Amino acid sequence: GPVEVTVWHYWDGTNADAFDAMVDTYNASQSDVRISASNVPNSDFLTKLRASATSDTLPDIAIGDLVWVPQIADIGTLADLNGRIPDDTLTDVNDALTSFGTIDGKQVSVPVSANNLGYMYNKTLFAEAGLDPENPPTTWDELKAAGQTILDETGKPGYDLYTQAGDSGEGLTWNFQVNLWQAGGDFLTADNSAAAFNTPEGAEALQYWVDLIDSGVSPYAKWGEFEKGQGGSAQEGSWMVGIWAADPPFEFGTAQVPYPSDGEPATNLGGEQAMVFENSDAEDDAAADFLSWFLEPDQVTEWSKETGMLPVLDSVATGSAYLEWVESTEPRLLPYVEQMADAHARPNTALYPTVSLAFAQEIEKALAGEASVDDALDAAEQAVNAVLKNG
Ligand SMILES: OC[C@H]1O[C@H](OC[C@H]2O[C@H](O[C@H]3[C@H](O)[C@@H](O)[C@@H](O)O[C@@H]3CO)[C@H](O)[C@@H](O)[C@@H]2O)[C@H](O)[C@@H](O)[C@@H]1O
């Protein structure tokens, strides 16, 4: 009988139905491996893995959020996927995501879905303000000026900023990182040992946020006005194209995230990564056989099409097949697809969640008007370095 391989994931809905259909397809396509997939709730997933390490009942495959990988790598020994998944598959996978998935030299994760942040806007409100509803802003200066027009002409915020840290800080941090990278900035140093953002580039990105808030274009603590149909625009994840293209709350448009004339295009990557917990070389190779099949172009194309998630393979994101389909079926996803070339991943440190909250709490003081841009970047660097240095 087949090698039995367990997969834990947190997908629900369409995504879980799609994944179960692909498991069925793989299971019926050969007799050497049988995949048994289970849903574990997103909020329960890490705590289940910690208990499972203690009870020696870890799954063979875990599929987790990007920022979980480094934490999971400390819960249980992860197999190296290099030499298990075909070299040409791993080369094709988005480089930011294979780099992210490299811990102690081993390819301990591979992405199996992707998403990124984009610019979404309300065409009806743009038109009401006297803007061209088909011509979104392309630069920071264009966004500030178009947002100012929306505020001046309609009394509504031109652009939402994610300005409150909340429980994790990640809404603020991961929206800010986009603009830090577009300014030519870095978040941590290349070895994740220290902050790298307390720079002219960092101050350019934070001064952008503070200028938007100070003008009233992006009020402090007013996230979600855009989503209510009461706001010009917002950074939104690619998953929103799918949620809205079905039952839209208003006529929305999408674009590349506006970037500074003195800078470069950038965005931030989300999505799910697969990890194989090390057992025997036979069992690791059984698990990696399923992941190899899952990462072939035909699977990645059909999976992306049906879930609205962005493909993890460069060859699919840039392929005529997939692009023609996006143009025919979900054309507002195209800017998100094109951004896969410029997208960055967060740093692969196991302290990232603590780093991100320490960062977000200090930066929020500048957004709230309680600190200067220079003092908040100094404070954020102190908080982050204390978290990184002291472990
Ligand atoms: O962009 C606003 C968002 O920012 C933070 O979350 C960052 C994570 O966003 C992604 O996860 C999203 C899923 O893809 C969606 O299908 C859905 O469940 O929403 C989550 C985020 O809530 C990304 O895949 C992750 O890698 C990112 O870390 C805030 O914490 C969120 O509250 C905001 O929604």
**In contact, 10 and 17? CB cutoff 8 Å:** no
| N- to C-terminal Cα separation, the chain | 46
Backbone angles phi, psi at 16, to 5 degrees: -70, -40
**In contact, 108 and 348? CB cutoff 8 Å:** no
Whole-number Å distance between alpha carbons of 83 and 227: 45
- Cβ-based neighbour number of residue 119 at 10 Å: 24
For ligand 1, say whether the CB of 70 is within 6 Å of any of its atoms.
no
**Which protein residue's CA is at the shortest distance from atom 25 of ligand 1?**
270
**Which protein residue's CA is at the shortest distance from atom 28 of ligand 1?**
270
- In single-letter form, the type of residue at position 230 comes to Q
- In a mutational test of the pocket of ligand 1, which residue from 116, 163, 170, 333 has the highest number of ligand atoms less than 8 Å from its CB? 170
Whole-number Å distance between alpha carbons of 244 and 229: 12
Structure tokens of 240? 């929103």
Say which DSSP state 189 is in. Answer: -
Give the list of residues 6+ apart from residue 10 with CB closer than 8 angstroms, or none.
39, 40, 41, 42, 45, 63, 64
Whole-number Å distance between alpha carbons of 291 and 113: 12
- Give CA separation, 34 vs 1, 264, 273, in Å: 9, 46, 20
Q: What is the DSSP string of 221-286?
A: T-TTTTTTT-SSEEEEETHHHHHHHHS-SS-EEEEPPPB-TTS---EEEE-EEEEEB---HHHHHH
Give the list of residues 6+ apart from residue 217 with CB closer than 8 angstroms, or none.
144, 147, 148, 150, 151, 157, 158, 159
Structure tokens of 236? 């939104």
Whole-number Å distance between alpha carbons of 197 and 199: 5
Whole-number Å distance between alpha carbons of 152 and 137: 17
Whole-number Å distance between alpha carbons of 159 and 150: 9
Say which DSSP state 114 is in. Answer: B
For ligand 1, say whether the CB of 172 is within 6 Å of any of its atoms.
no
Backbone angles phi, psi at 254, to 5 degrees: -135, 155
- Cβ-based neighbour number of residue 13 at 10 Å: 8
Token pair 């429980």 in the structure block, residue: 167
Structure tokens of 259? 């970037």
Say which DSSP state 30 is in. Answer: -
- In single-letter form, the type of residue at position 312 comes to V
Cα angle at 63 between 278 and 59, to 5 degrees?
A: 40
Structure tokens of 136? 């979104």
**In contact, 209 and 176? CB cutoff 8 Å:** yes
- In which region does residue 135 sit, left (phi positive, over 0), alpha (psi from -120 to 50) or beta (all else)? beta
- Cβ-based neighbour number of residue 227 at 10 Å: 18
Q: Taking the domains of the chain in order of start, what are their residue ranges?
A: 1-115+270-342, 116-269+343-391
- In a mutational test of the pocket of ligand 1, which residue from 45, 65, 357 has the highest number of ligand atoms less than 8 Å from its CB? 65
**Which protein residue's CA is at the shortest distance from atom 15 of ligand 1?**
239
For ligand 1, say whether the CB of 115 is within 6 Å of any of its atoms.
yes
Ligand 1 atom nearest the C-alpha of 117 is 1
**Which protein residue's CA is at the shortest distance from atom 3 of ligand 1?**
171
Give the list of residues 6+ apart from residue 176 with CB closer than 8 angstroms, or none.
205, 206, 209, 363
Whole-number Å distance between alpha carbons of 374 and 377: 5
Ligand 1 atom nearest the C-alpha of 15 is 16
**In contact, 269 and 97? CB cutoff 8 Å:** yes
Ligand 1 atom nearest the C-alpha of 236 is 1
Whole-number Å distance between alpha carbons of 121 and 286: 45
Q: What is the resolution of this structure in A?
A: 1.5
- Cβ-based neighbour number of residue 315 at 10 Å: 16
For ligand 1, say whether the CB of 270 is within 6 Å of any of its atoms.
yes
- Cβ-based neighbour number of residue 65 at 10 Å: 17
- Alpha helices in 117-223, H assignment, sequence order: 123-128, 140-154, 170-182, 200-214
Structure tokens of 84? 């298990």
Q: What is the DSSP string of 335-378?
A: HHHHGGGGEE-----TTHHHHHHHHHHHHHHHHTTSS-HHHHHH
- In which region does residue 109 sit, left (phi positive, over 0), alpha (psi from -120 to 50) or beta (all else)? beta
Cα angle at 269 between 356 and 89, to 5 degrees?
A: 130
**Which protein residue's CA is at the shortest distance from atom 29 of ligand 1?**
171
